[PDB]
Every structure is written in structure tokens, then in C-alpha cells.
Design a protein around this ligand. Sequence first.
Ligand SMILES: [Cl-]
Ligand SMILES: [Cl-]
Ligand code: NA
Ligand code: NA
Ligand code: NA
Ligand code: NA
Lengths: 304, 303
Amino acid sequence: MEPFKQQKVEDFYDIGEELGSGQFAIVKKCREKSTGLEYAAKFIKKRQSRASRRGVSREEIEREVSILRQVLHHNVITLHDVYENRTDVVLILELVSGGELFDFLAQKESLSEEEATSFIKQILDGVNYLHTKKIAHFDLKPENIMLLDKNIPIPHIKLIDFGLAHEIEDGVEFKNIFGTPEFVAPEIVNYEPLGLEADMWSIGVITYILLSGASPFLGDTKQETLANITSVSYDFDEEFFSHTSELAKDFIRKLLVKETRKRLTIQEALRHPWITPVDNQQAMVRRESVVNLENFRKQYVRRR
Amino acid sequence: EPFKQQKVEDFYDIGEELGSGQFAIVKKCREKSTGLEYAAKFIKKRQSRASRRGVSREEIEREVSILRQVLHHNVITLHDVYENRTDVVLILELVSGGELFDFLAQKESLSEEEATSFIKQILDGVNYLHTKKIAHFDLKPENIMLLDKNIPIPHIKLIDFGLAHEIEDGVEFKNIFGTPEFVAPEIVNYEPLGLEADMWSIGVITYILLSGASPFLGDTKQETLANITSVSYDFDEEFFSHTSELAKDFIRKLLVKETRKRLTIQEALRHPWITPVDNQQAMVRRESVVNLENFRKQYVRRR
Ligand SMILES: [Cl-]
Ligand SMILES: [Cl-]
Ligand code: NA
Ligand code: NA
Ligand code: NA
Ligand code: NA
């Protein structure tokens, strides 16, 4: 149960540019002095007691670390080390510096559904790895879908940010309200038992956006968004979906399901004919279906 | 009605940060023309419905609309509103005496009669809002401020109308918001909201004021939400050994899941802990004390 390292992080690491942050965490590029190899340092601020406004609980820090220690897959971020000082716990993580998937897609000259599906398959492969280990990510959304390097022809996806991830336990009910409203399943909004299915919903949301530039449930305010989610009110309006294949629409429709039991599981998603064509006729349809990147760019730029 | 389009810094000298909440920063200011001091709340405007940051126009207009309606001695008073390309700026009454709980934490001695003095001020403020069908929706200690620490019994101002909402008869309002420690079950459970949620939050505030302890606060949000939704709390003698039965009964009527059964603001004002009916009740309340040591220990942890 490797103890967290008590030595000063700056004594063993050079610290460079900010990569990002959340509410109680900041991420910075770093380099281990002894090896010269680069990583990302995630500084998580510790709480004072339990009614502290600021900082993350020990339970929550330790859960994130436990889960990260378990994971070794080519589509998931890998943990290098953990340090702790008076104010923070510092996670030294694989450096993933190629930006968000969506930023890369926004710069393309064109995108086919075949190309789209080989990005989505990479996400599905990392999620399958997690789900096989009974790990739910619980924060699947475009900003946590990162690329190693944006300058190879077909960039490699890494799932990041395990701050909400949780191990699903046999016969135990897990209920909580968390995440970004746009991307959360109805069981989160409704304070109902949660499990691996919630990740599958989020995958339908990400796929919908990827293909269209629009978001299925997003309203003018949070109040509207929550109402849309819980009533599963979304469309495939021709404004945004004119170019989309029927199999793409079927894939999404099978993920954006309220009843957790009826939603595709990760292995069912992987086998779905949009991802895994059954014949050449279908492979052709998928190759010839394009994404309107204009709409995609328009909406991605607006999120910035 | 229109927001002022002139540059706020042309009419105000702008000073130190006093607070920096959600997508809002509050700074001290003085209006050049009059010499009078105020607080300037700068609210970042959202750029798109899924902009990562900023606040929707709907939400800004709602806070302003509500602020424009409220004029009461226990409620912050709006002075003016300015808008630029970036922000909408609310010029508010400057409330400089700090948080109520910080004042209470310095005291040597606090009786329940004194505590009810402060609670009644909150109830008066809330009564004024509720009569206008305005739910505050963010009642918690950090929004209960003082004008001036240096009078015998300081004057309370309810601040921070960022979550406030007008409650319309027959129109269902459902949403999930607020600070978990302080939110009512109907918030957690995504059920119809109204004026009752504020009453729950008053019970929580009261519980904390009297004990230093928080009724539903768990080790993590997951535990807090389960505590709230099951209405799981206690009056542990560790924290409540000094507390009167009157005070416990007031709390017990507010920390109720069933919205219809929860005390209303008028019922809270008439409760005998607040408004004794006889001298026997008055003496019990006067003689019951708060253990300020526990209060202090717990308030300093929030620091
Ligand atoms: Cl802790
Ligand atoms: Cl876990
Ligand atoms: Na499409
Ligand atoms: Na907003
Ligand atoms: Na619910
Ligand atoms: Na007490």
C-alpha cells in the first residue's frame, strides 16, 4: 500500500506550465530530475476537517489513488508516483500533452463516420478495461478525452481525471449527485442507484456531440438541462443530423435510455454494427457518411 | 429598469476585494459624486449555453429583478446596476461588520435569549421575502452578515441573492443547487421547490448556532446527501447538554421532510422559543446557555 512520499516535490521535480485545474486541484507539467522524464503533477488540496469549504477529503483522495494504481491500459492515464505535504496530495501522472480530442477534430478538413468510430472505439476500449475491473469513471465528457500527440495521423486517446471514479460493489447501492449536468445520466439527477451504466449514457452524449456539434439535453440554464435529461427529451433534428447514418443514430438511441437495465453495456456497444460492421455493404455506408465539421467547429469555438 | 452602460470606474473609485464567489467578485467602492461607500459585485457574463464559465442572462436578470423589489432592514439593499462587454456589476449596500458566526465566536457568554435575538432578525428578513413569494434558496451562515460589530446587539443583513427565485402558484420549480450541508431533501430528491426549503435551512443554521455541530454533515458529500434524505440527525449530549427543550422542539419542527408539515415562516415566528407565551418559558430561555467553546472550536476549523 505504497506510502505517499513525504519529500518535497520540488526537490525531485522541475515544475513547468499549468495544464489545467478543477475546483480543488491544479495540474502542472513536471520533469523527474533523476531520470529527465516528463510527467503531469496534479496538486489536490486537502481539507481541514469535514465542514471545510475548501479541499478534498482524505477518503476521496485515497479512492482516486487506489483506482489509478490498478489501471494499466493504452487508452487510460497511468500513475507514476504520489507525494503529500502539509497542504496537498500530489499525483505524478503520465503526461498527456496533445490537447482535447475535440480541439483536434475541429481543425480537420473533413471527418467520416469511419474515422469518427475509430476515435469512439478507443474510448470504448478504455471504458471496457475499466468496466471489466468494476470501475466506473463517472466523469466521461469531452475535456477528459485527451490525446497523446496531435501530430500523428490518427491520434491516440487517453481517458483522464479519475476524481469521480468509483469501484462498483456487489449488492451495494451507491447514490450521489456529481458531475457536469450536460453529461450526466438520469440516475444521477434522480439520486438513484448508480453503476457502470452511467458511463454508457455519457458515451451516447459525447457521440451525439461529436457527430453533430449539438448537445442532446443542454438547455438555456441548468434547470432546463435537468428537466431534459430526466424526461429523456432529445432529437435528431435534420439541422444537425442531415449527414448522419441510421446506424449512428441507432447506436446513440440505444445508449440514451433511462432504464439502466435496457442501456447497452460496454461489450454490447463494442459489438454494435456502427462500431463493428457485419459486412462490406455496411462498412461502405459508414465510410461515405460524413460529419459536418462547420457545425462542429461553430459550437466548439462557442465553448471557449 | 435598464442597466447603466457607462464605465463603472468613471463613477466609482474601486478598491479591495471583499469576496470572490461563483462567477462573481465583490470589491469595495465609493461613488465619486456623493462620497458614499458600497460593494461592487462583478458578475461574469456567460458567452454560450455550454460556455465552461460565466452566468446566463436569465440568472443575472433574476437576481437583479429580485434585488430591485426588496427593501427591508434585514435585507441587503441594491443601489445601482452597470453592464459592460464582460460583466454585469451590482452596486450593493456595503455590509462591513463580518459574518454573524464570527461575532458570536468572540463572545464570552451567549444565552438562548440572546441567540433568539439574532435568529428573530433572520426570521424577520425571511418573513419579508416570503410575503413577496421570494425564496432566498442560499440561507447559510456565510450569507448572514452584520452591519457593525461594535453595538451591543449587532444588526443582521441577509445577502447573496444569486439563487433566489420567485415562487409562482401552480408553476412547478425543480432544480438542484446550493451547499449540500444546508439544502433541504426536496432539493436532493429533485422534487417541487418553494418557500419551505428556506425553513429547513433556518433549522440547520439554528442547530449550528446552538451547538457548533452540523445536523447532516457527513465525512463526504455522499454521506451528507444520505443523511439529508433520511432525515438522520441527533441532539448528542456532547453538543446539546445545555440546550433547552424549547430550542430542540423548534429545530425538530423545521427539520421535517414533508414540505407541508414543516413550519412556515409565520409559524416559526410564533413558536414559543422565539415568542414565549409565559414567564416560565422566558426564564428557561434566559437561563439556557450555548457552550461557546464547542462553537468556537468548530467555527475555527472553518478557517
Ligand atoms: Cl479528511
Ligand atoms: Cl471506489
Ligand atoms: Na452527423
Ligand atoms: Na448560469
Ligand atoms: Na430524486
Ligand atoms: Na445549546
